[PDB]
Design a protein around this ligand. Structure first.
Ligand SMILES: CC(C)CCC[C@@H](C)[C@H]1CC[C@H]2[C@@H]3CC=C4C[C@@H](O)CC[C@]4(C)[C@H]3CC[C@]12C
Ligand SMILES: O=C(O)Cc1ccc(CCNS(=O)(=O)c2ccc(Cl)cc2)cc1
Ligand SMILES: [Zn+2]
Length: 461
């Protein structure tokens, strides 16, 4: 037999034929192509009903729908065999409604749900979703506005990338989500099929992982720029940074593309306003769930590890005697310590060390040593990098942990039909709603964590 989705397409392809067709020959043939697909789809076992036996009332209630669809196809096929062109055109038109009730709800991306029509009505809020979305977009546009005045840094390139990623994220997902709330989570209304749902899943993983990986990219710019000599050859550094952003996006799209390649699955999630990786126990669902959570988690982890070391370096260096770093191995010459093993007792100013003194780490001369200059720009960026890091810690980590736990749950978290408890269905929505805040708060870390803001909003205290 053929996949329910393949038959679903056949039924649409032919429904579109009958619509534009002018004679009963084309109409009859398109309806003949329909009937076999409906008969084929009846032999199929939807994923939504994997745990049911064929004898099951849930299973025969499914097969009866195809009896009804075939019944209508035959009712229209009788009219096409009558030569009644306009009549057969109309009888096949009502099949659009019929296919939604008997095929569309069993399509792959549709997991089972015990959410009543009543629950959907009150949960449906397009105007609030729109409001939140607009707030998110405005914020991001505001960050880019501020960025436009400020900027050439490798840091700022990633910050721009992260603000731009957040904006498109809120705009593309927001639009889907608002439409769903406007359509009371009835997918067929917006787009019949699993295509929009699958697109939404890829978009979710893309805009999920991207702000996390770019957050980690920023933590690495700070780490290298602070630990290694503060040599900022912009244009090159900005190219290296935009290229990294592009790789970050490519890697984030490539992972969002895995459920399409059969590693994982995109299915509609409670309340029905969005799609995501399926939180199942299936080998793929586990591999993809952990891949996503491990990557986001490691991104936030690595961001913490690096940032603490960069702050540790900024605090040690931006305090005390005039430190000079080796521009070959980064060795920070601390007058405070000296090099007593090489006759430079503690308290020796760099200006007081002889030429016949070499770097105790790499061995290069005093000529290859640069003065460590205190820059408020380095402080401003370190603050924004920590701010971005804390935002991701607070918003993303709960969801990332939740995903990995759900996927690794001792008694399976998901039923064989693909159903989740309404507590886990709610937990995920709450955890996702939290993650949404990272895309709203990242532009504000840039807007607020600035030396000019500190200055203009100083006499408040
Ligand atoms: C130009 C370079 C950098 C590569 C980017 C190509 C992008 C835009 C393309 C290539 C393959 C595309 C995907 C192919 C298949 C599907 C399945 C469909 O149900 C929803 C959209 C979705 C998810 C597409 C989204 C966009 C996509 C990821
Ligand atoms: O309230 C609802 O109806 C449920 C719901 C809320 C918000 C969205 C999309 C939020 N967009 S986002 O902040 O860019 C984002 C967030 C997480 C990821 Cl993994 C990727 C992108 C979807 C569904
Ligand atoms: Zn050195």
């Amino acid at each position: 037999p053929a996949d329910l989705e393949d038959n679903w397409e056949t039924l649409n392809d032919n429904l579109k034929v009958i619509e534009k067709a002018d004679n009963a020959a084309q109409v009859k043939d398109a309806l003949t192509k329909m009937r076999a697909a409906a008969l084929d789809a009846q032999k199929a076992t939807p994923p939504k009903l994997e745990d049911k036996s064929p004898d099951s009332p849930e299973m025969k209630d499914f097969r009866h729908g195809f009896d009804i669809l075939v019944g209508q196809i035959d009712d229209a096929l009788k009219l096409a065999n009558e030569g009644k062109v306009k009549e057969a055109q109309a009888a096949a038109e009502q099949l659009k409604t019929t296919r939604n009730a008997y095929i569309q709800k069993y399509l792959p991306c549709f997991r089972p749900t015990n959410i009543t029509l009543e629950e959907r009505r009150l949960i449906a809020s397009p105007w609030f979703a729109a409001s939140f979305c607009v707030v998110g977009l405005a914020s991001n546009l505001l960050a880019l506005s501020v960025l436009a005045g400020a900027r050439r840094s490798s840091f700022l390139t990633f910050l721009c990338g992260l603000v731009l990623t957040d904006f498109l994220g809120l705009l593309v997902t927001g639009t889907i989500v608002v439409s769903q709330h406007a359509a009371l989570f009835e997918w067929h209304a917006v787009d019949p099929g699993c295509r929009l749902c699958r697109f939404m899943g890829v978009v979710m993983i893309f805009f999920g992982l991207s702000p996390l990986l770019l957050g980690a990219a920023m933590a690495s710019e700070r780490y290298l720029g602070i630990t290694r000599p503060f040599s900022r050859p912009a244009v090159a550094s900005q190219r290296r940074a935009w290229a990294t952003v592009g790789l970050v996006w490519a890697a984030a799209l490539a992972l969002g593309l895995l459920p399409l390649l059969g590693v994982g699955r995109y299915t509609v999630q409670y309340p029905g306003s969005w799609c995501f990786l399926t939180l199942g126990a299936e080998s793929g669902d586990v591999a993809f769930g952990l891949l996503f959570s491990m990557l986001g988690g490691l991104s936030v982890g690595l961001s913490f590890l690096l940032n603490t070391v960069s702050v540790a370096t900024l605090c040690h260096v931006y305090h005390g005697m005039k430190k000079y770093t080796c521009t070959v191995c980064g060795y920070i010459y601390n007058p405070e310590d000296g090099d007593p093993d090489n006759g430079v007792n503690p308290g020796t100013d760099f200006k007081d060390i002889p030429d016949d003194w070499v770097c105790p780490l790499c061995g290069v001369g005093k000529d290859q040593f640069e003065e460590v200059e205190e820059r408020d720009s380095e402080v401003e960026m370190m603050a924004q990098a920590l701010g971005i890091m804390v935002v991701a810690s607070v918003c993303w980590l709960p969801l990332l942990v939740f995903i990995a736990q759900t996927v690794l749950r001792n008694p399976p978290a998901m039923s064989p039909a693909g159903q989740l408890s309404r507590t886990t269905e709610k937990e995920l929505l709450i955890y996702l709603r939290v993650a949404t805040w990272n895309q709203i708060l990242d532009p504000w870390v840039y807007i607020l964590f600035r030396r000019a803001v500190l200055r203009r909003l100083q006499p408040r205290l």
